[model samples]
Target: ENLYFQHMKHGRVFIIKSYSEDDIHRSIKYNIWCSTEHGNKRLDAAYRSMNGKGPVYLLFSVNGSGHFCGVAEMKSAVDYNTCAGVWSQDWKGRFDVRWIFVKDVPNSQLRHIRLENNENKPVTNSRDTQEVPLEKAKQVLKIIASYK
Candidate 1:
């Protein structure tokens, strides 16, 4: 596998809670990461940091049962268009991606997991729409790196 550290350092998670792995996993074929217009601010930030700057690395998180399942470099900026009817419900927000890693993984494989007794995990507010911290982003990469 190839490594692009700039994307790693400039990374974010496009968390998908309401959707099923069955629905979201389809993007693995098309290389398009879809999201609602609601999360566009972080998208814009990632866009501005592309190769003209440098592409922001992307991690895709599914249901809380299974944490992170995918990684890609967010390629094109937000399209404000469609998923080309990729899903049952398409969104007004989208961006192309260069897929780096993916799996139908478990929390044991990649969730920044803990029993809630520890105080050191990166604050990944599952309910709060935001980017993960630097280390947590790296952890996603690191955990997935060993598998493939």
Candidate 2:
């Protein structure tokens, strides 16, 4: 209970791989991210992992590639039908985040920060949505603020 409360203030982290930087910006612009219904497994994991937790941090991978170019605090996650057709397009799940872009993360340590699956082995680059550790999430927060 003590660590849980401590972690709550620190927040949780999730990495969302997107099609491109433009798509990543669009989600930031509209303040929401959506995903398909059945393909919603990891997003669901993101949702479950984040609820009632502290702030939720999101790492936006660039151009669907290996680089992460943006960071934000996820505010909420819910069903797409909850806000159907409200965005430029609609999907089955919606996650709202408060995000901003950075030129480059500038922190190689981010690579050292990894997420394990439910099995807790390694490599869930199913390339879907996945999580990183909260401490690193906070480390990312401070580094992101290291902007010029």
Candidate 3:
């Protein structure tokens, strides 16, 4: 089989519930879905193979929803030029790139959501406790909807 670079898009969005570290007495395993999508089976399988063994940070549900559940390790800033079909490296920056497969998304919803989810975080002293709020999640959903 020929090797081909796949173009993947993130579809669904999820709200991650906040947890208190000290409240629980023992070890606890919590799983949450992050994104979902459909189509491009072979590409999906390939991505799974590459990411599966690494510390197993994120657990992906291939139930055609592209939902992933689990804590993900921090990712390094990606070089846009190195990524397939990305035209400009100048615009590349830090991002948590999640993949999903989906068929249909609405336009107005996408626009409104982007306005919500893409707000810039104000510079702050605390980095350890930063988390995206539910409003942001809805914004992300709209951002996903905006894509073609």
Candidate 4:
């Protein structure tokens, strides 16, 4: 139910939680809208990097009323790319995985989804469901990095 509009280099990053039904539903819709806009970037990047050999289908997880929850694909089990580039040459210890379209999910959703949280910062009180864990967040990062 809160909004923060920041004009930055990337784009708008929406953050909302499920304290109330209204907020949850609104955030879900907002997530879908944002995903529709940016998910394609990740997907396109994936398609290009894998030489059109990556996922050929896509799905969006929706809420009770068939509202958008997040994006997914049923075709392939995820690949963890352990040799991706880093922000700097020295940051090479990190493993890499690519083609992650969904990011910025709330903490509640993270817990619900049971996604890996190996690299996540210690859970904080202020963290929302939309805030993806560090490890899960990297999935999307890898996808973006694979782009030309």
Candidate 5:
């Protein structure tokens, strides 16, 4: 796990809400994208802050549910020019798009659980798409690596 951390130290991790965790758990969605609207600005900031230095890991979860469905690694940088001309009331222009291709965590290696406190209370303060703490991100990576 230490080795994994070393290699991914400069990387970023984000928690995303999938309308349906089944798609993620089944590896149906292999890409994650966002636009420059609402809270997506955070994702944009994260990408810029990385300066194209490291891979991005996504922790997938079902909306309104705290349970994590799966994890995936970003295989590309933000592609701002693709998917142009798409209509969106929230966006200022067609160039306000960014995307990343991802490979889902295998079922044999996947772990889904709701984080809870020592008293068995659920932690429900998850974000839409924000950079995760290095320590916590490392723990997730460790768990993912241990499966295979």
Candidate 6:
């Protein structure tokens, strides 16, 4: 299995994305998602793996210019329920709504760390979300903690 999928299946820290700094702030309470079947399936796996320990999400936010705005930790577990009349509904008038709570790393902390990969590429890629290695994730958290 791919490293990302493997870690997610084991309730490990995995990266997700937010569109802008505001979106990241909004998630400090809860982040909502109306997922496709594939996305839902992955969430289900992660929920099961979490088993009530630690965060199931790590967030990365990107600006309009494709630069990283910040990173955050989703401090709560992942939960989902049926949405009958939610804005995300499709023709069937039903969808699974997922909620994950987040806690942002202050910009003062995040601003100091370099956002580059081994190849010197931006860690925040063009995709809306993606999984990152555990070591990289820990390194980010460590940097943020240092400012405390």
Best by lDDT: 1
Candidate 2 residue lDDT tens string, 1-148: 1233234454656666666555666786778776556435555566567566556666766543645677776666655466566444445567676776555654353544444442442322425455666654555555555644
Candidate 6 TM-score, C-alpha based: 0.48
- What does candidate 4's lDDT look like per residue over 1-148, in tens digits? 2111111122112111222344334333333212222333443344345443423323233333222233333222223333433222211121112223544334333332223342434222222323343333343333332333
Model 5, 1-148: lDDT tens digits are: 2575645567777777656444443343324444355445566566567776876667666666534555655544455555543332223221122232333444334333223321321222455664566655676666655543
Give all TM-scores, in the order shown.
0.68, 0.62, 0.21, 0.24, 0.54, 0.48
lDDT of each: 0.58, 0.57, 0.28, 0.31, 0.51, 0.43
Q: Output the worst ten-in-a-row residue range by lDDT, candidate 4.
A: 2-11
Q: Identify the runs in model 2 with alpha carbons over 4 angstroms from their true place.
A: 1-9, 36-53, 63-66, 82-90, 106-109, 114-126
lDDT minimum window of 10 residues, candidate 2: 117-126
Query: In candidate 1, what residue range of length 10 has the lowest lDDT sum?
Result: 114-123
- Model 2: lDDT equals 0.57
Q: Every model's Cα RMSD, please?
A: 4.8, 5.6, 18.7, 17.4, 6.6, 8.0
Q: What local lDDT does model 5 show for residue 139? A: 63
After superposition, candidate 6 runs with Cα above 4 Å error: 1-11, 20-26, 29-37, 63-81, 84-122
Candidate 1 lDDT, tens digit per residue, 1-148? 5554324444455444436666556667778766666676567666675545444666566646555666677777777755466665645666777788776445567544321322554333353245555555555566667664
Which residue pairs show collisions in model 1?
A: 50-54
User: Which portions of model 3 miss their true places by more than 4 Å?
Assistant: 1-75, 80-96, 111-134, 139-148
lDDT of 4 at 102: 40
* After superposition, candidate 5 runs with Cα above 4 Å error: 21-32, 64-66, 74-125
Which sections of candidate 1 miss by over 4 Å? 1-18, 83-85, 109-129
How many residue pairs clash (N, CA or C atoms closer than 3 angstroms) in each of the candidate models, in the order given? 1, 0, 7, 11, 0, 0
